[PDB]
Every structure is written in structure tokens, then in C-alpha cells.
């Protein structure tokens, strides 16, 4: 582990210090279909004419990014994503920009969002959930060792690849920070009490989010849900959680430790770091090495009717890609 991380960090820093840029053009691709939508732009299934390969191209309207004051978070996303490298992290193939947009070409993960499958099937069996959880556990061990904080873990941001494994996508709020940060961001249901209470936080919020995910995958619904966000935050800070009667005793224990309001006693944030999690009973049958290597059998394998298939994604209205004849927000995105 420690040996591994050490090398991973040296590779990350080389790219972190000298990120790549303008490694493609819009015309080197064929726009096929919208795979999802965001606030600054849509993610489109695209085809690299030269290689004939399929990619998920994330488009960001520079002006909208500026209106929402997401400039730094956006630069954070491209800078971090172009430098990391882990099995369960979607890879950024190319990145470029034009008069009005920023582009990030990622690998296309046909399997679809965990969200879709999870909502449809209702809930995952504990073993099934343990499978995905294990992957998130290692992915965070990786990310955090790089001084990175993901800040937006949720079913919507996890894709299932052809082998049935997880691919974390969307680093919109990822940040490289040693020490503590204060930005209020993330998704309501998954927010740590610290964030909601504007007290300054760290990686610990990623572990609390892990608890929320595991609970949602196991129960079929979040540990804290309501109709209005404010009602949700009230539930979160109350340090009161209810578990489905079917949750195993081990599972409930692991969750009581993750959804720990007291940063002094929250798994992942103790002297034993992540090991307090890896060595937890609920993960007894989990062979961590076997997971990182993708040797373990995937409990679910989304199949596709061929390359370019988008049957695992919802349908969105198709918006044309317009590019002003005038450069927009040039100085703000110079390093992109």
C-alpha cells in the first residue's frame, strides 16, 4: 500500500505541476447524443473520427461557469482529472476549449449510472453493495493520499463499466487541499454536518458521504431524505439515524461509525486512517487486492447491444453547440 501510494503520488505531481492542454479540437469528433446534463453544459456521447473510438465529451459554457462563480472549481476539475490515474476513476482522454466552451473528453462508460440501476431495482443486496463500497474505499484512499477531496459522492456520479466495476466521474468539486477548506458544495443528502454548519472541514466529509452511499445502496433510499433541502440538513445535524430492519448487525455498526457527527470518532479520520474501514467486519470477505485488480466477480454486468449503445442512459433534448465568433472569458480560463 504505502509503497504503491508513494509512486502514484510521484506520477500525479508530475502532471499536477505541468498539466496538459489543447490536446484535440471540436472537429475531430462527431456529436452523437446527450448522455446526461449538468448546470454548465451537457455530456455528449461522441465519436473520435480518426480512431473511431467513442468518448463522453463534457461541455461547459464559459460564460455560465463565470455567472455561477465556478471558475476555480472548473480549473480544479480539469487540472486534477488530467493528472490522476486509478482503476475506478474515469479517464480524461483529451481537453480543449473554443470561443465559448470548455471541453473534457472522458472515456465513455456504457454501463450507465449506478443511480439508474439502483432506483430501478430498488436496492442492492449487501454483498452487492459491499462490492461497490470496497471500490470507493480504495478510490478515496488513493485520492486522499494525494491531498485531494472529492466532495460529491453519489449514485449519479458513479458509472458501471462493461466489466461491472465502478468509474467515478465528475470532479466538479474535487480539490487539492492540505489543511481545511470552507466551500459549501456537494449534494444535500450527502453533506457532512461540518459543511452544513460552516465550520471548515477536510477529507472526513468524503468518508461520511461513503456512509450515505452504502446506506442508500443497501436500503434503497438515503438515511436522510425530505422534500426540501433545509429539511434534509436538519435531519443530518440531529445525529439521529434509523436503519432498515434488514440491515445486518455488521452493516449497522460500520454505518454508525461512518455517519458519525463527531469527527473525533468517525472512521477514516482516526489514527488507523482507512484501515479502521478496511479491517471492519462488514468487509471481512473483501479481498482488497483482488478488488483493485478487478479479479473479483462483478455481481451485475450491464450488457450493451454494441459500441455506441446508449440504452443504459436516459434521453435528453438535443441542444445545438453554438460557438461565438468572439472569444469569451479568455483571461479567466487561460490555463485550461
Amino acid at each position: 500500500v504505502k509503497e504503491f501510494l508513494a509512486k502514484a503520488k510521484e506520477d500525479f505531481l508530475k502532471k499536477w505541476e505541468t498539466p496538459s492542454q489543447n490536446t484535440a479540437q471540436l472537429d475531430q469528433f462527431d456529436r452523437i447524443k446527450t448522455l446526461g446534463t449538468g448546470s454548465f453544459g451537457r455530456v455528449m456521447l461522441v465519436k473520435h473520427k480518426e480512431s473511431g473510438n467513442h468518448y463522453a465529451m463534457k461541455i461547459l459554457d464559459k460564460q455560465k461557469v463565470v455567472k455561477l462563480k465556478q471558475i476555480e472549481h472548473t480549473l480544479n476539475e480539469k487540472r486534477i482529472l488530467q493528472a490522476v490515474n486509478f482503476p475506478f476513476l474515469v479517464k480524461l482522454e483529451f481537453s480543449f476549449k473554443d470561443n465559448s466552451n470548455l471541453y473534457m473528453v472522458m472515456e465513455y462508460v456504457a454501463g450507465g449510472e449506478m443511480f439508474s440501476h439502483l432506483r430501478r431495482i430498488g436496492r442492492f443486496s449487501e454483498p452487492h453493495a459491499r462490492f461497490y463500497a470496497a471500490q470507493i474505499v480504495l478510490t478515496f484512499e488513493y485520492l486522499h493520499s494525494l491531498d485531494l477531496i472529492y466532495r460529491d459522492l453519489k449514485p449519479e456520479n458513479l458509472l458501471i463499466d462493461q466489466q461491472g466495476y465502478i468509474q467515478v466521474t465528475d470532479f466538479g468539486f474535487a480539490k487539492r487541499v492540505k489543511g481545511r477548506t470552507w466551500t459549501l458544495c456537494g449534494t444535500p443528502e450527502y453533506l457532512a454536518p461540518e459543511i452544513i454548519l460552516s465550520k471548515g472541514y477536510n477529507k472526513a466529509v468524503d468518508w461520511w458521504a461513503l456512509g450515505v452511499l452504502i446506506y442508500e445502496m443497501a436500503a434503497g433510499y438515503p438515511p436522510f431524505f425530505a422534500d426540501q433541502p433545509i429539511q434534509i440538513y436538519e435531519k443530518i445535524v440531529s445525529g439521529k439515524v434509523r436503519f432498515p430492519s434488514h440491515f445486518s448487525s455488521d452493516l449497522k455498526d460500520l454505518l454508525r461509525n461512518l455517519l458519525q457527527v463527531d469527527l473525533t470518532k468517525r472512521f477514516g479520520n482516526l489514527k488507523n486512517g482507512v484501515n479502521d474501514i478496511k479491517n471492519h467486519k462488514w468487509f471481512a470477505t473483501t479481498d482488497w487486492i483482488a478488488i483493485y485488480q478487478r479479479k473479483v466477480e462483478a455481481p451485475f454486468i450491464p450488457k450493451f447491444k454494441g459500441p455506441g449503445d446508449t440504452s443504459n442512459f436516459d434521453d435528453y433534448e438535443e441542444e445545438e453547440i453554438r460557438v461565438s465568433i468572439n472569444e469569451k472569458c479568455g483571461k479567466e480560463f487561460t490555463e485550461f
Partner: peptide, 20 residues
């Protein structure tokens, strides 16, 4: 049931992030 309440809630669809 908890499940029922969730399914009848308005937050079963894709949830957006909060910038602010």
C-alpha cells in the same frame, strides 16, 4: 413504510449539487 415515503417524495430523481 419508509420506502413508500421516499417513492412519494420529490427527491427520487437525479439530485443536483448546490453551488452557492
Amino acid at each position: 413504510t419508509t420506502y413508500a415515503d421516499f417513492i412519494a417524495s420529490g427527491r427520487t430523481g437525479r439530485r443536483n449539487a448546490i453551488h452557492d
